[PDB]
């Protein structure tokens, strides 16, 4: 539709409530970023539908979130033409679509405390190693190898782009990554031709996309927070059932402190994330501007 063709280019686009339109929205973004003659369409469509099937009906880390995160990546890539290679752009959009595959609405910390079998298999970045494993499993289904026209070397290359990008959505990793990037910026040593540096920038891009609810317009941001807390509070209930006091953010008894919690997150995570991103990629400034506006809104709630 014309309104979507126009507004999909905005960083603060919302993908709407019609689920059956989201696959086509993703294909549109893939074709604009990577070209039409670079995925076989029927195979891409089959892949997308299997990815959708492997997302769960949870409040926040669901299929809608996957496509939303992919859209943020599309907007970053569209506004930074010439920086990322064709393979990187394909890899990143696919990584975003797949990055929360099979998410149950629980953190890595909860999996560890539960003694879930995934935590024995993957001791660090547990869910994220699982998300990548699931991505590979879907790619290996008959007729689902969207990368079948790549050489073996390019296939290995894009799967590694995807693995690194999915792992980078473990927010635990963000703090250290952003610290290193900020030092590289301050000292003028960031080198986008250096693969280690380049991987870090991509990781920050993945964080920025994953957190992008705080870069929407206030009505969208506020509504999305309801879904984020529905998951967090259910996890806190589950902590209590294990006999463990949950942290305030997961404890529904502490919900009156939501605005203070939001301030904490914007100050410690979101504003620094988008500030560092804008320093490296100036055209991403609208994400930072929107984030600052939402911080002001939470401050107003407190007032
Ligand atoms: C964008 O979505 C959210 C942002 C922040 C939170 C959040 N809520 C609380 C609460 C404390 C008490 C009652 S609620 N704390 C946070 C929070 C503070 C700091 C963070 O990272 C450093 C991370 C999280 C929840 C959702
Ligand atoms: Mg995740
Ligand atoms: Zn996510």
UniProtKB/Swiss-Prot annotation:
Name of the gene: Pde10a
Binding residue positions for a divalent metal cation 1: 65, 99-100, 210
Record: residues binding 3',5'-cyclic AMP: 61, 262
Factors inducing expression: Up-regulated in brain after seizures. Up-regulated in the hippocampus one hour after induction of long-term potentiation.
Localization of this protein: Cytoplasm, Cytosol
Organism, scientific name: Rattus norvegicus
Full protein name: cAMP and cAMP-inhibited cGMP 3',5'-cyclic phosphodiesterase 10A
Quaternary context: Homodimer.
Recorded family membership: Belongs to the cyclic nucleotide phosphodiesterase family.
Residues at the active site: 61
PDEase domain mapped to chain residues: 1-303
Tissue: Detected in striatum and testis (at protein level). Detected in whole brain, hippocampus, olfactory bulb, striatum neurons and testis.
Span of the entire protein shown here: 465 to 767 of 794
Role according to the record: Plays a role in signal transduction by regulating the intracellular concentration of cyclic nucleotides. Can hydrolyze both cAMP and cGMP, but has higher affinity for cAMP and is more efficient with cAMP as substrate.
Domain notes: The tandem GAF domains bind cAMP, and regulate enzyme activity. The binding of cAMP stimulates enzyme activity.
Annotated a divalent metal cation 2 binding sites: 100
UniProt: 3',5'-cyclic GMP binding residues: 61, 262
């Amino acid at each position: 539709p014309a309104r979507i063709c126009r507004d999909i280019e905005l960083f603060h686009f919302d993908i709407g409530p019609f689920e059956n339109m989201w696959p086509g929205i993703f294909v549109y973004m893939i074709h604009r970023s990577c070209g039409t003659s670079c995925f076989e369409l029927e195979k891409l469509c089959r892949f997308i539908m299997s990815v959708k099937k492997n997302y769960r009906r949870v409040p926040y880390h669901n299929w809608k979130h996957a496509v939303t995160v992919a859209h943020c990546m599309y907007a970053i890539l569209q506004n930074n033409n010439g920086l990322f290679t064709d393979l990187e752009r394909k890899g990143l959009l696919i990584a975003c679509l797949c990055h929360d595959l099979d998410h149950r609405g629980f953190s890595n910390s909860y999996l560890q405390k539960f003694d879930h079998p995934l935590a024995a298999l993957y001791s660090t970045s547990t869910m994220e190693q699982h998300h990548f494993s699931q991505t590979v499993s879907i790619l290996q289904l008959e007729g689902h190898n969207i990368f079948s026209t790549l050489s073996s070397s390019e296939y290995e290359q894009v799967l590694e782009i995807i693995r690194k990008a999915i792992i980078a959505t473990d927010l635990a990793l963000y703090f250290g990554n952003r610290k290193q990037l900020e030092e590289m910026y301050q000292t003028g040593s960031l080198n986008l031709h250096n693969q280690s540096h380049r991987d870090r920038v991509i990781g920050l891009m993945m964080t920025a996309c994953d957190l992008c609810s705080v870069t929407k317009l206030w009505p969208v941001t506020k509504l999305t927070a309801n879904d984020i807390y529905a998951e967090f509070w259910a996890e806190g209930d589950e902590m209590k059932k294990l006999g463990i006091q949950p942290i305030p953010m997961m404890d529904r008894d502490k919900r009156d402190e939501v605005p203070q919690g939001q301030l904490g997150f914007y100050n410690a995570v979101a504003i620094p994330c988008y500030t560092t991103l804008t320093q490296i990629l100036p055209p991403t400034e609208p994400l930072l501007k929107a984030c600052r506006d939402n911080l002001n809104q939470w401050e107003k709630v407190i007032r």
